[PDB]
């Protein structure tokens, strides 16, 4: 559109449980604070998932 300069910008919300989702809100099932908020971080190991 006119009168908005020469640049266009767009957001992106992919990281729902991917590795790129980096945050400090995590709390594990026991109730303690943990480093990563995402549950798995795109790991296919059965041990980590369990």
């Amino acid at each position: 559109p006119k009168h908005y300069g020469k640049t266009i910008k767009v957001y992106e919300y992919v990281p729902l449980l991917d590795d790129r989702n980096i945050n400090d809100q995590g709390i594990d099932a026991s109730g303690a604070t943990i480093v990563n908020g995402n549950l798995y971080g795109s790991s296919k190991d059965i041990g980590n998932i369990t």
Binding site: K2, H3, Y4
Partner: protein, 50 residues
């Protein structure tokens, strides 16, 4: 000393004259302008800048 006085038999005694003068005026020309580009109007944040 300079009064106009006649006599009993007076002719060609007190002559006077007159004078006129002139005034004048003239006219002149003034002006100024400004320039702009299409991009300046289209991409500026403020519409109605003109």
């Amino acid at each position: 000393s300079k009064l106009p006085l006649l006599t009993e038999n007076g002719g060609r005694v007190n002559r006077v004259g007159f004078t006129r003068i002139a005034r004048e005026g003239s006219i002149h020309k003034f002006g100024f302008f400004y320039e702009f580009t299409q991009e300046s109007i289209d991409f500026d944040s403020d519409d109605g800048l003109m």
